[PDB]
Amino acid sequence: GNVARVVVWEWLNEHSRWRPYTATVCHHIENVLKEDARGSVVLGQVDAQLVPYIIDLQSMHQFRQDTGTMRPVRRNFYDPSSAPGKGIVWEWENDGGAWTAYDMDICITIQNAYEKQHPWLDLSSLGFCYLIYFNSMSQMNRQTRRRRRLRRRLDLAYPLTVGSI
Ligand SMILES: Nc1ncnc2c1ncn2[C@@H]1O[C@H](COP(=O)(O)OP(=O)(O)OP(=O)(O)O)[C@@H](O)[C@H]1O
Numbered sequence: 809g810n811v812a813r814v815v816v817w818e819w820l821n822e823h824s825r826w827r828p829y830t831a832t833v834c835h836h837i838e839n840v841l842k843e844d845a846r847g848s849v850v851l852g853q854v855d856a857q858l859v860p861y862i863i864d865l866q867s868m869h870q871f872r873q874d875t876g877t878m879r880p881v882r883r884n885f886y887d888p889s890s891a892p893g894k895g896i897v898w899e900w901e902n903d904g905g906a907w908t909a910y911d912m913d914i915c916i917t918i919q920n921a922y923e924k925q926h927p928w929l930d931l932s933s934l935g936f937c938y939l940i941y942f943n944s945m946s947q948m949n950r951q952t953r954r955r956r957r958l959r960r961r962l963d964l965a966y967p968l969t970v971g972s973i
Contacts, residue, residue, distance in 0.1 A: 809972070810970045810973070811970070811971045812888045812968055812969070813888065813968070813970075813971050814885065814887065814888055814890060814892045814967070815838060815883060815885060815967040815968070816828050816834060816885070816886055816912050816966050817829045817833070817834045817863075817882070817883055817884070818881065818882050819870050819879050819881050820879050820880045820881075825911055826882065826912075828892075828912045829851075830909075830963070831892070831963055831965060831966045832854055833851060833855055833858070835967055836849065836851075836853070836854040837849050838967045838969075841865060841883075844865070845866075847865050848863065849863040849865065850862055851863065860873050863881055868880065868881055868882070869881060886912065888968060890916045890919070891912075891915050891916050891918075891919040892965065894962070894965055895962050895966075896915075896960060896963075897915065897960070897961050897963045898914075898915045898918045898919060898958060898959070899958065899959055899961065900947050900956050900957070900958045901956055901957040901958070901959075902956075907959065913934065914934065914936070917929065917934070921940070927941070927943060928940060928941045928942065929942075930950075932950070937949060937950040937951050938950060945957065
């Protein structure tokens with residue numbers, strides 16, 4: 809039998825959290841992997857801001873060209889009914905005015921709460937002292953009460969592949 813699953817490539821950050829690459833980058837990574845299992849993904853070819861980084865598919869690590877520092881990467885899978893299967897992305901605004909995507913597990917949970925018409929979502933069970941309020945469209949830190957704008961966009965869907973069973 810065949811089952812469909814959404815591919816989300818993730819890289820491990822300094823806070824030990826798996827961060828998603830954007831859908832555009834994930835399609836490029838999958839295309840390189842389909843050509844060669846031990847290839848190198850030059851992320852600068854698809855996103856100028858990621859010009860320092862290369863994904864070494866042989867070792868499954870992202871490395872910075874100028875420093876040699878390595879970060880583990882993973883070809884993760886999510887359900888096709890989840891946000892990345894359609895291209896839905898939830899993002900929060902930093903002090904500088906830039907928008908950052910939530911970690912994929914949190915993005916999926918926010919979208920699931922939003923479509924079930926829940927007024928809010930407490931992320932404390934996931935290990936995050938924050939509340940997402942949908943009527944005001946803002947995130948609030950539970951301990952300090954600081955608010956940040958949030959938004960949803962319809963970007964590109966992440967790659968979707970078949971798993972054989
Ligand atoms: N793919 C990526 N997308 C976005 N930010 C990234 C990516 N890879 C790493 N970063 C971030 O870049 C910053 C610097 O880490 P990087 O892996 O580039 O090099 P480094 O050698 O660890 O840097 P340094 O030791 O000088 O801080 C960190 O905040 C890290 O989370």
